[PDB]
Structure 1
């Protein structure tokens, strides 16, 4: 079981090789794929803000 800090809790159901994962326009595959249907029903928009800002910080070397 994994979780974010916004009450988004999940259970790992499948482990894929990195070449089977969806990948970005820089070629990097993603590490996890979450269901987007979990957000509107649970109404925890804060995870959307955090994930975007986390990506910016990693590329900018910022916390």
Structure 2
């Protein structure tokens, strides 16, 4: 069981090699893939804000 801090709980069903996980435009494959359908039903948009800001913080080296 993995979960964020916004009530987005999740069970791990698949483990894929890094070469077939979806990857960004810088070539880095993503580490985990979530279902976008969870947000509208559960109505927790905070993870959407945290997700985007986490990417910015890691690139800018900020917390």
Q: Give the TM-score normalised by structure 1.
A: 0.99
The runs of at least 4 consecutive aligned structure 1 residues that moved more than 4 Å come to none
Residue 40 of structure 1: how far off its partner (Å)? 0.2
**1:1-63, aligned counterparts within 5 Å?**
1-63=1-63
Residue 51 of structure 1: how far off its partner (Å)? 0.4
Gaps of 5+ in 1: none
Gaps of 5+ in 2: none
Report the number of matched residues. 63
Residue 33 of structure 1: how far off its partner (Å)? 0.1
* 1:15-45 alpha-carbon deviations (Å, 9 max, x no partner): 0000010000000000000000000000000
Q: Give the TM-score normalised by structure 2.
A: 0.99
Residue 13 of structure 1: how far off its partner (Å)? 0.1
